């Protein structure tokens, strides 16, 4: 019941993922070094991590079937708004339920609540972010469902500033139907129970996290000396 096109779409998204996500995290050594102590000591390191991840999110989006057909301005709008959400999704791969932290290959590059707090964020974001990572982890998505969820997150028509919303929605619909059919044919029970609905709920959760993140980003970036620690791409994307 999974058509040839839908098996094609999945193969593409999986490939795009493999070419844009490095599970060895080798490049992290290029970042400004993580400093754990106290005042914003993790901002330069995590800011570089984010900036790096935006580049990977961009590379992924471009390989989403139909994404290229959008106008450059719609592409910009979709990436600007979803980037932090897709990074949070991407990060679930490094997130371990063992100690509720993001474990990226080593101890220096192991990130926990106190590391995120030392990036300038409060529990008002961090609590639901971990809550999100745990609940997403519990879903035990196939990698196919993971990459589909990320594509669907990027191509949302209700994003602020979207012009050709009809065209965006058509692209997303084709992806949603690909996901829904995949779960029915490829994801066995009980793991497939209400799985689509739960995955959609996660997209709602990400909107909320995106909103809280923006508020706290405006606070942090409001101060030039902290804004000074970010990267040009992070300012361009998370900025106005």
């Amino acid at each position: 019941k999974l058509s040839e096109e839908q098996q094609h779409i999945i193969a593409i998204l999986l490939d795009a993922h493999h070419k844009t996500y490095d599970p060895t995290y080798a490049d992290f050594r290029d970042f400004r070094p993580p400093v754990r102590m106290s005042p914003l000591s993790m901002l330069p390191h995590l800011a570089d991590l984010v900036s790096y991840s935006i580049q990977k999110v961009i590379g992924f989006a471009k390989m989403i079937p139909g994404f290229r057909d959008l106008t450059s301005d719609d592409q910009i709008v979709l990436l600007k708004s979803s980037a932090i959400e897709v990074i949070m999704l991407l990060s679930n791969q490094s997130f371990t339920m063992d100690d509720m932290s993001w474990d990226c290959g080593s101890q220096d590059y192991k990130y926990d609540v106190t590391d995120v707090s030392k990036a300038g964020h409060t529990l008002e974001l961090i609590e639901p972010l971990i809550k999100f990572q745990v609940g997403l982890k519990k879903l035990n998505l196939h990698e196919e469902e993971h990459v589909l969820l990320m594509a669907i997150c990027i191509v949302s028509p209700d994003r602020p500033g979207v012009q050709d919303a009809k065209l965006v929605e058509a692209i997303q619909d084709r992806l949603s139907n690909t996901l829904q059919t995949y779960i029915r044919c490829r994801h066995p029970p009980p793991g497939s129970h209400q799985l689509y609905a739960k995955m959609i709920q996660k997209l709602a959760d990400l909107r909320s996290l995106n909103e809280e993140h923006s508020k706290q980003y405006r606070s942090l970036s409001f101060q030039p000396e902290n804004s000074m620690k970010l990267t040009p791409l992070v300012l361009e994307v998370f900025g106005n």
Binding site: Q55, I58, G59, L79, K80, P232, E236
Partner: peptide, 11 residues
């Protein structure tokens, strides 16, 4: 709209 680097990475 005024996103040089984002648009450059998109092309």
């Amino acid at each position: 709209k005024n996103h040089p680097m984002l648009m450059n990475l998109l092309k």
